[PDB]
Short mmCIF file of C-alpha atoms in Angstrom, two decimals:
data_model
loop_
_atom_site.label_atom_id
_atom_site.label_comp_id
_atom_site.label_asym_id
_atom_site.label_seq_id
_atom_site.Cartn_x
_atom_site.Cartn_y
_atom_site.Cartn_z
CA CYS A 1 -7.57 -18.04 29.92
CA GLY A 2 -5.31 -18.05 26.87
CA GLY A 3 -5.54 -14.30 26.34
CA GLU A 4 -4.42 -13.45 29.88
CA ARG A 5 -1.12 -15.27 29.22
CA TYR A 6 -0.08 -13.62 25.95
CA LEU A 7 -0.88 -10.15 27.30
CA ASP A 8 1.17 -10.74 30.46
CA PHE A 9 4.22 -11.05 28.19
CA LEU A 10 3.53 -7.75 26.42
CA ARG A 11 3.54 -5.94 29.77
CA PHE A 12 7.26 -6.70 30.13
CA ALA A 13 8.16 -5.27 26.70
CA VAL A 14 6.45 -1.86 26.99
CA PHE A 15 8.30 -0.75 30.12
CA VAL A 16 11.50 -1.95 31.76
CA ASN A 17 12.15 0.28 34.79
CA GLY A 18 9.63 2.91 35.85
CA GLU A 19 7.59 3.84 32.77
CA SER A 20 10.22 4.15 30.05
CA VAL A 21 11.16 2.87 26.56
CA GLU A 22 8.44 4.07 24.17
CA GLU A 23 9.77 3.13 20.71
CA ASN A 24 8.51 -0.44 20.99
CA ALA A 25 5.53 0.84 22.96
CA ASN A 26 4.61 3.20 20.12
CA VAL A 27 4.52 0.41 17.54
CA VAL A 28 2.50 -1.86 19.85
CA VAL A 29 -0.57 0.39 19.85
CA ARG A 30 -0.26 1.16 16.14
CA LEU A 31 -0.07 -2.59 15.45
CA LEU A 32 -2.71 -3.73 17.95
CA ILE A 33 -5.31 -1.35 16.47
CA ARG A 34 -4.90 -2.92 13.02
CA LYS A 35 -6.58 -6.11 14.23
CA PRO A 36 -9.79 -5.00 16.00
CA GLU A 37 -10.67 -8.63 16.75
CA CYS A 38 -7.87 -8.54 19.35
CA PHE A 39 -10.31 -6.75 21.66
CA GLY A 40 -12.81 -8.94 23.47
CA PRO A 41 -16.06 -8.91 21.50
CA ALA A 42 -18.01 -7.67 24.54
CA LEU A 43 -16.85 -4.17 23.54
CA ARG A 44 -15.02 -2.55 20.61
CA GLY A 45 -17.41 -4.17 18.16
CA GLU A 46 -20.59 -3.67 16.14
CA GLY A 47 -23.24 -5.19 18.40
CA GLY A 48 -22.65 -3.47 21.73
CA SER A 49 -20.03 -2.44 24.24
CA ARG B 1 14.14 1.11 -2.65
CA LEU B 2 17.62 2.20 -1.57
CA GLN B 3 17.02 5.58 -3.23
CA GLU B 4 13.73 5.99 -1.35
CA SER B 5 15.71 5.26 1.83
CA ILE B 6 18.41 7.92 1.44
CA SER B 7 15.85 10.57 0.48
CA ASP B 8 13.91 9.49 3.56
CA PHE B 9 17.06 9.92 5.66
CA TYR B 10 17.50 13.46 4.32
CA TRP B 11 14.21 14.71 5.80
CA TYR B 12 15.21 13.50 9.27
CA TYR B 13 18.21 15.85 9.07
CA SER B 14 16.52 18.68 7.15
CA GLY B 15 15.76 20.73 10.26
CA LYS B 16 19.12 20.31 11.98
CA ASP B 17 22.21 22.40 11.25
CA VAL B 18 25.17 20.08 11.89
CA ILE B 19 25.40 16.33 11.33
CA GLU B 20 26.75 14.50 14.37
CA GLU B 21 29.55 11.96 14.10
CA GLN B 22 27.24 8.94 14.16
CA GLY B 23 25.06 10.68 11.58
CA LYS B 24 27.89 10.40 9.03
CA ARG B 25 29.41 7.00 9.83
CA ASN B 26 26.21 5.21 8.83
CA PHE B 27 25.51 7.67 6.01
CA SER B 28 28.82 7.00 4.24
CA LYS B 29 28.11 3.26 4.53
CA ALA B 30 24.97 3.53 2.39
CA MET B 31 26.43 5.83 -0.27
CA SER B 32 29.40 3.50 -0.78
CA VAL B 33 26.97 0.66 -1.52
CA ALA B 34 25.05 2.81 -4.02
CA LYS B 35 28.27 3.54 -5.91
CA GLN B 36 29.01 -0.17 -6.31
CA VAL B 37 25.53 -0.80 -7.72
CA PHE B 38 25.98 2.00 -10.26
CA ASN B 39 29.25 0.45 -11.44
CA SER B 40 27.45 -2.79 -12.30
CA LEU B 41 24.68 -1.13 -14.31
CA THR B 42 27.30 0.38 -16.62
CA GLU B 43 28.89 -3.00 -17.31
CA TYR B 44 25.69 -4.45 -18.73
CA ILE B 45 25.66 -1.63 -21.30
CA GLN B 46 29.34 -1.02 -22.09
CA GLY B 47 30.23 -2.79 -25.30
CA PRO B 48 26.86 -1.95 -26.82
CA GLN C 1 -2.76 7.61 -18.28
CA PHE C 2 -1.77 8.37 -14.68
CA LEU C 3 -2.85 10.76 -11.95
CA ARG C 4 -1.02 14.06 -11.58
CA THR C 5 -1.13 17.03 -9.26
CA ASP C 6 -3.58 19.89 -9.92
CA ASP C 7 -6.14 17.46 -11.36
CA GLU C 8 -9.88 17.43 -10.65
CA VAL C 9 -11.35 14.04 -9.73
CA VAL C 10 -14.23 12.41 -7.86
CA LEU C 11 -14.45 9.56 -5.37
CA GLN C 12 -16.61 6.50 -5.99
CA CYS C 13 -17.81 3.51 -3.97
CA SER C 14 -20.01 0.58 -4.97
CA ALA C 15 -22.33 -1.12 -2.47
CA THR C 16 -25.35 -3.17 -3.51
CA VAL C 17 -28.66 -2.65 -1.70
CA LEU C 18 -31.45 -4.38 -3.67
CA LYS C 19 -29.17 -7.26 -4.77
CA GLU C 20 -28.06 -4.93 -7.59
CA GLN C 21 -25.01 -2.68 -7.67
CA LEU C 22 -25.56 1.00 -6.83
CA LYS C 23 -22.79 3.52 -7.47
CA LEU C 24 -22.36 6.02 -4.64
CA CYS C 25 -20.15 9.11 -4.66
CA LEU C 26 -19.06 11.46 -1.89
CA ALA C 27 -20.01 15.14 -1.90
CA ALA C 28 -20.99 18.02 0.35
CA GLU C 29 -22.63 21.38 -0.24
CA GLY C 30 -20.18 23.53 1.73
CA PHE C 31 -21.66 26.70 3.24
CA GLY C 32 -24.14 25.71 5.96
CA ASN C 33 -23.46 21.97 6.30
CA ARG C 34 -19.96 20.99 7.42
CA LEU C 35 -20.99 17.32 7.19
CA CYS C 36 -20.79 15.11 4.11
CA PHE C 37 -23.24 12.64 2.58
CA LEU C 38 -23.72 10.28 -0.37
CA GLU C 39 -25.23 10.97 -3.80
CA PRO C 40 -26.62 8.01 -5.79
CA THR C 41 -25.69 7.98 -9.48
CA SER C 42 -27.30 4.73 -10.63
CA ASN C 43 -30.22 6.03 -12.75
CA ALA C 44 -28.52 8.59 -14.99
CA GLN C 45 -30.93 7.63 -17.79
CA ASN C 46 -33.85 8.99 -15.74
CA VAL C 47 -32.50 10.66 -12.57
CA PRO C 48 -29.98 13.44 -13.30
CA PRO C 49 -27.20 13.18 -10.70
CA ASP C 50 -25.90 16.37 -9.10
CA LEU C 51 -22.21 16.63 -10.03
CA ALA C 52 -21.82 20.34 -9.26
CA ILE C 53 -20.62 19.55 -5.71
CA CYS C 54 -18.96 16.16 -6.27
CA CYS C 55 -15.84 17.60 -7.91
CA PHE C 56 -12.59 17.42 -5.92
CA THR C 57 -8.99 18.31 -6.75
CA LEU C 58 -5.50 17.19 -5.76
CA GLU C 59 -3.13 19.90 -4.55
CA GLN C 60 -0.27 18.27 -2.62
CA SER C 61 1.41 14.88 -2.42
CA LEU C 62 4.25 14.20 -0.01
CA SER C 63 5.97 11.37 1.81
CA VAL C 64 5.13 10.82 5.46
CA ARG C 65 8.49 12.12 6.72
CA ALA C 66 8.25 15.20 4.50
CA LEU C 67 4.78 15.83 5.91
CA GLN C 68 5.92 15.45 9.51
CA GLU C 69 8.91 17.75 9.07
CA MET C 70 6.70 20.33 7.34
CA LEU C 71 4.30 20.16 10.30
CA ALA C 72 6.94 21.81 12.51
CA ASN C 73 7.26 24.78 10.12
CA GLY C 74 5.38 21.62 -10.28
CA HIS C 75 3.64 18.35 -11.11
CA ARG C 76 4.35 15.14 -9.20
CA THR C 77 2.92 11.66 -9.74
CA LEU C 78 1.11 9.76 -7.00
CA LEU C 79 2.64 6.62 -5.51
CA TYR C 80 1.19 4.24 -2.95
CA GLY C 81 2.39 5.11 0.55
CA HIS C 82 2.47 8.88 0.04
CA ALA C 83 0.13 11.36 1.72
CA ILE C 84 -2.52 13.51 0.04
CA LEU C 85 -4.42 16.78 0.51
CA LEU C 86 -7.95 16.73 -0.89
CA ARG C 87 -9.65 20.01 -1.76
CA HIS C 88 -13.31 20.56 -2.61
CA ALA C 89 -13.41 22.46 -5.88
CA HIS C 90 -16.57 24.55 -5.51
CA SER C 91 -16.57 25.70 -1.88
CA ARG C 92 -12.73 25.80 -1.79
CA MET C 93 -12.54 24.02 1.56
CA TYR C 94 -10.22 21.20 2.57
CA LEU C 95 -11.62 17.76 3.31
CA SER C 96 -10.71 16.52 6.79
CA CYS C 97 -12.00 14.50 9.75
CA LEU C 98 -13.79 16.05 12.72
CA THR C 99 -14.03 14.95 16.37
CA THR C 100 -17.81 14.94 16.83
CA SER C 101 -20.14 12.09 17.78
CA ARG C 102 -22.87 10.70 15.53
CA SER C 103 -25.07 7.63 15.03
CA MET C 104 -24.71 6.76 18.75
CA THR C 105 -22.84 3.56 17.90
CA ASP C 106 -20.77 3.50 21.13
CA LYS C 107 -17.82 3.33 18.81
CA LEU C 108 -14.93 5.23 17.19
CA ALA C 109 -16.94 6.76 14.34
CA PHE C 110 -15.57 10.33 14.21
CA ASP C 111 -17.88 11.41 11.38
CA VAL C 112 -16.24 13.12 8.42
CA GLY C 113 -16.32 16.85 7.81
CA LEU C 114 -14.49 19.67 6.05
CA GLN C 115 -13.97 23.07 7.69
CA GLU C 116 -10.87 25.08 6.70
CA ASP C 117 -8.03 22.94 7.88
CA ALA C 118 -5.10 24.28 5.91
CA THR C 119 -3.14 23.74 9.12
CA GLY C 120 -1.70 20.26 8.79
CA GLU C 121 -2.88 18.15 11.67
CA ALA C 122 -5.96 16.17 10.58
CA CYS C 123 -6.42 17.17 6.92
CA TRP C 124 -4.14 14.54 5.37
CA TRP C 125 -4.63 10.96 4.21
CA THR C 126 -2.31 8.13 3.25
CA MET C 127 -3.37 5.62 0.61
CA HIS C 128 -2.48 1.94 0.42
CA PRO C 129 -3.04 -0.67 -2.29
CA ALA C 130 -5.94 -3.03 -1.71
CA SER C 131 -4.78 -6.41 -3.06
CA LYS C 132 -1.41 -8.16 -3.10
CA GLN C 133 -0.89 -7.40 -6.81
CA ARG C 134 0.38 -3.89 -6.02
CA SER C 135 3.07 -2.72 -3.61
CA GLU C 136 4.53 0.43 -2.12
CA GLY C 137 6.43 2.90 -4.26
CA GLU C 138 4.45 1.96 -7.37
CA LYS C 139 2.86 4.36 -9.83
CA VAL C 140 -0.91 4.73 -9.51
CA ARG C 141 -2.75 3.26 -12.48
CA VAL C 142 -5.87 5.16 -13.49
CA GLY C 143 -8.96 3.41 -12.17
CA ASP C 144 -7.27 1.45 -9.38
CA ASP C 145 -8.78 0.61 -5.98
CA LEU C 146 -7.53 2.58 -2.98
CA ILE C 147 -7.77 2.33 0.80
CA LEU C 148 -7.51 5.67 2.60
CA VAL C 149 -6.34 6.15 6.18
CA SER C 150 -6.40 9.32 8.27
CA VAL C 151 -2.93 10.53 9.22
CA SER C 152 -4.08 11.91 12.58
CA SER C 153 -6.74 9.54 13.89
CA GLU C 154 -5.54 6.42 12.01
CA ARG C 155 -8.97 5.12 10.97
CA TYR C 156 -10.11 3.83 7.58
CA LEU C 157 -12.79 5.97 5.96
CA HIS C 158 -15.66 3.53 6.51
CA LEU C 159 -18.89 3.29 4.53
CA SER C 160 -20.83 2.53 7.71
CA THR C 161 -24.34 1.35 6.89
CA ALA C 162 -26.84 0.88 9.71
CA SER C 163 -30.57 0.58 10.35
CA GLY C 164 -31.13 3.99 8.74
CA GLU C 165 -29.71 5.19 5.43
CA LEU C 166 -26.08 4.88 4.34
CA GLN C 167 -23.61 7.04 6.26
CA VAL C 168 -19.87 7.71 5.97
CA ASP C 169 -17.39 7.87 8.85
CA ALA C 170 -14.03 6.35 9.87
CA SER C 171 -14.62 3.63 12.45
CA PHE C 172 -14.22 -0.09 11.80
CA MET C 173 -13.10 -1.57 8.45
CA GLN C 174 -11.98 -0.96 4.88
CA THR C 175 -13.92 0.70 2.08
CA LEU C 176 -12.90 0.12 -1.54
CA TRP C 177 -12.77 3.52 -3.26
CA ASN C 178 -12.35 3.74 -7.03
CA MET C 179 -10.90 6.96 -8.39
CA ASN C 180 -12.23 8.78 -11.43
CA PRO C 181 -10.48 11.32 -13.69
CA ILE C 182 -13.18 13.97 -14.15
CA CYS C 183 -10.75 16.21 -16.05
CA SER C 184 -7.15 17.45 -16.22
CA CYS C 185 -5.18 20.52 -17.33
CA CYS C 186 -7.38 21.70 -20.20
CA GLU C 187 -6.39 23.98 -23.06
CA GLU C 188 -6.97 27.73 -22.88
CA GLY C 189 -9.73 29.34 -24.90
CA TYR C 190 -11.73 26.16 -25.54
CA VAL C 191 -15.11 25.09 -24.19
CA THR C 192 -15.05 22.23 -21.68
CA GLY C 193 -17.81 20.43 -19.85
CA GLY C 194 -18.95 21.49 -16.42
CA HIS C 195 -18.54 25.24 -16.96
CA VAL C 196 -20.96 28.00 -15.98
CA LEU C 197 -21.37 30.57 -18.71
CA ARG C 198 -23.74 32.80 -20.68
CA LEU C 199 -25.45 32.49 -24.07
CA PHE C 200 -25.35 35.59 -26.25
CA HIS C 201 -27.40 35.76 -29.43
CA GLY C 202 -27.05 38.05 -32.41
CA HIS C 203 -24.10 40.42 -32.80
CA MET C 204 -23.50 42.78 -29.86
CA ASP C 205 -26.00 42.83 -26.95
CA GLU C 206 -28.56 40.02 -26.73
CA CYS C 207 -28.64 36.88 -24.62
CA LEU C 208 -30.79 34.00 -23.43
CA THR C 209 -32.67 34.42 -20.15
CA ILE C 210 -35.74 33.38 -18.16
CA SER C 211 -38.61 35.38 -16.65
CA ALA C 212 -37.90 37.76 -13.79
CA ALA C 213 -38.36 37.12 -10.07
CA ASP C 214 -41.57 37.48 -8.04
CA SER C 215 -43.99 35.96 -10.53
CA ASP C 216 -46.43 33.05 -10.65
CA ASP C 217 -45.12 31.73 -13.99
CA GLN C 218 -42.92 29.27 -12.03
CA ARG C 219 -40.02 30.03 -14.42
CA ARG C 220 -41.26 27.79 -17.22
CA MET D 1 -12.64 -10.15 34.95
CA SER D 2 -8.96 -11.09 34.66
CA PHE D 3 -8.90 -10.40 30.91
CA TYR D 4 -10.38 -6.91 30.63
CA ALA D 5 -8.64 -5.71 33.78
CA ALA D 6 -5.31 -6.91 32.40
CA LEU D 7 -5.95 -5.35 28.98
CA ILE D 8 -6.51 -1.88 30.42
CA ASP D 9 -3.44 -2.45 32.59
CA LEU D 10 -1.49 -2.86 29.35
CA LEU D 11 -3.03 0.29 27.86
CA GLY D 12 -2.25 2.35 30.94
CA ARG D 13 1.48 1.77 30.85
CA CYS D 14 1.59 1.79 27.04
CA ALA D 15 0.72 5.49 27.55
CA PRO D 16 2.75 7.88 25.36
CA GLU D 17 5.17 9.03 28.07
CA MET D 18 5.50 11.09 31.21
CA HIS D 19 5.00 14.83 30.85
CA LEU D 20 8.70 15.20 30.00
CA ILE D 21 7.70 14.60 26.37
CA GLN D 22 3.96 15.33 26.46
CA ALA D 23 4.58 18.95 27.52
CA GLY D 24 7.28 19.78 24.96
CA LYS D 25 6.45 17.88 21.77
CA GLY D 26 3.56 17.11 19.43
CA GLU D 27 4.19 13.52 18.37
CA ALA D 28 3.21 11.82 21.64
CA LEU D 29 -0.06 13.78 21.78
CA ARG D 30 -1.27 11.79 18.77
CA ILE D 31 -1.01 8.52 20.72
CA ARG D 32 -2.67 10.01 23.81
CA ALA D 33 -5.70 11.04 21.75
CA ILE D 34 -6.09 7.51 20.37
CA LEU D 35 -6.04 5.60 23.66
CA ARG D 36 -8.21 8.20 25.41
CA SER D 37 -10.84 7.76 22.68
CA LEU D 38 -11.25 4.03 23.43
CA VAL D 39 -11.99 4.19 27.17
CA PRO D 40 -14.69 6.74 28.08
CA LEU D 41 -14.06 8.37 31.44
CA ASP D 42 -17.74 8.38 32.45
CA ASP D 43 -17.93 4.58 32.62
CA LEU D 44 -14.38 4.24 33.96
CA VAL D 45 -15.00 6.45 37.00
CA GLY D 46 -18.08 4.41 37.93
CA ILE D 47 -16.30 1.06 37.73
CA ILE D 48 -14.50 1.70 41.06
CA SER D 49 -17.44 0.66 43.24
#
């Protein structure tokens, strides 16, 4: 429940009008990867995917 | 850190041939600051 | 004192297994096995470790922007934040990261391997300090602890242990690597360790040797 | 269901760019390789059922 609210915000800062603005988009993926725990532990983990 | 920044800025313009007008307005801003810093360093040493 | 270009060095990691520390280095044979594995060096008093293939060497060191501008087309000192170009000394092949699948971990392993990759796309690493004591743009003290990240894939070189033996890849977390100055720019005309060379005896033409091939003496 | 569906929605528009850049440059291709390596196509194609 909490996760679906934070991520909804990020959707509005990656694009503005028809799949544009990549400078902030570029740093989002390079920053999000640094914390693997951001992914739901069902996948992207050590146990299983 | 400022020196590592100007040298970083040089590589971004290494492959071009002419520096556009907004490529110099910001550039001269940084070099003016570096000159002021150098003036200070002398005045801790002058008058041995 | 400090690391320099054109120096020969070896990697080193320390992971305990039997509740006692075991030193593990990184090495590969070269011709015939593009993959890389680990060589234990914890029982030097009884088990002679194989250091003929563990030797590496540093050839280039550049800032990230210098690297990226070079991609489109002396003796320096290493600083944290710069890039690096490893080079295996014996086989003369460049260490890199491949795009194969191994260990069936349903993961982002991308097992390590060295092929030829002089072309600068996936053969470069950037190093960062481990703890908060150090910072960027600082000189690299001999015997520090480094964290290495692939420039292309952006994964830490992970000492990924599993149910089987210990394997190396770049998937999930950090791996503390301690550097080691095997040697440096030696002096000409003087014997140094780790050389391969012959043993003459007498005055002109006589040398040490072993029995010839195709014999049952087992070369003893 | 809301979470994982929304996460992939983020990493579908956080794509490098349209082919205006992906067909005439080599920086954006680095990002495309990363995100493509996290979502296998074999499972993704089967999920629409």
